[PDB]
């Protein structure tokens, strides 16, 4: 949405943001008025994981976008933890046009994530981020990002300015093993 200049709308179903969507609030399709005004638009719902309200909102938005929506360039996205919990209505062919998998980062992908987030810290030269990536098997990007943030914490605990390799290793042990 940032690169295609598409308006990014996050639909969490929160009643706090309901006054902005509309005073009616009876049906979730009332947000389409704000979506058409900001076309191209990307409507994003994340399922934190009764029945799922995010998946319910998917059906209402997808049904309108099928052939009953005049304005084009209104895309919709769902983020879910698992694909086998989805309703059969969403899993029906023709409803979701593409399903993209986000596997946990492997050794090389973790290094790329480690390289991205460690650029926001005062790093001593010669940090072997490859070893730190190897020390985090089966970790997510958020966990890798949190390891960097905790690595800077350990520098502060020793009142240091530059983050050393020991700090990253101590951060890996705390984030993964302890937590």
């Amino acid at each position: 949405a940032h690169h295609t200049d598409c308006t990014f709308i996050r639909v969490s179903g929160s009643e706090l943001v309901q006054k902005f969507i509309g005073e009616g609030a009876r049906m979730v399709r009332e947000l389409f008025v704000m979506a058409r005004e900001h076309a191209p638009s990307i409507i994003f719902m994340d399922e934190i994981d009764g029945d799922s309200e995010v998946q319910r909102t998917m059906l209402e938005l997808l049904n309108q976008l099928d052939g009953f929506e005049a304005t084009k360039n209104i895309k919709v996205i769902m983020a879910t933890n698992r694909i086998d919990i989805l309703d059969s209505a969403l899993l029906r062919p023709g409803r979701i046009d593409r399903k993209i998998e986000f596997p946990p980062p492997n050794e090389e992908a973790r290094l790329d994530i480690l390289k991205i987030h460690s650029r926001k810290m005062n790093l001593t030269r010669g940090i072997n981020l490859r070893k730190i990536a190897e020390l985090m098997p089966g970790a997510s990007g958020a966990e890798v990002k949190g390891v960097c943030t905790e690595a800077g914490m350990y520098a502060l605990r020793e009142r240091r300015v530059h983050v050393t390799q020991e700090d990253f290793e101590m951060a890996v042990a705390k984030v993964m093993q302890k937590d």
Binding site: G13, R26, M27, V28, R29, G50, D51, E53, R56, L59, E60, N63, Q64, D66, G67, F68, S88, A89, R92, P93, G94
Partner: protein
Amino acid sequence: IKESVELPLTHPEYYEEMGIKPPKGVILYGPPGTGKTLLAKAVANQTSATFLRVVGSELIQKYLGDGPKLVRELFRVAEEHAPSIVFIDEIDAIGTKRYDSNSGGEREIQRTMLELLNQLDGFDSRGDVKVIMATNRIETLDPALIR
């Protein structure tokens, strides 16, 4: 579907000379992806009447009585824009899906169902409002609804 939503409007003389009001309601049922919503899209393409589309899951509300209120308000707008075609797509989703946001449980859904019973065929006189319902699970509907 044409004789219930298209022919009565384009050629009302056929019904009048025969002495019968057109078939009141219609429901499209079958396996998913069979073309139930597509036929309504074709119906909406070649209709001179106002087309109102509501998914059955939209009738499940967060507060007591708003479910019946929304059904009551949906058919009021249909009466204002007469003639009109009301497409209640995925009608079975009102009962086959349970959400915690719906304060009342199955009992509030039943009250919403009873409100829809009144709108389809009740005390109030109905104008030129044609109702189309779609469902892939017709066995889960209340038989009094599709009577």
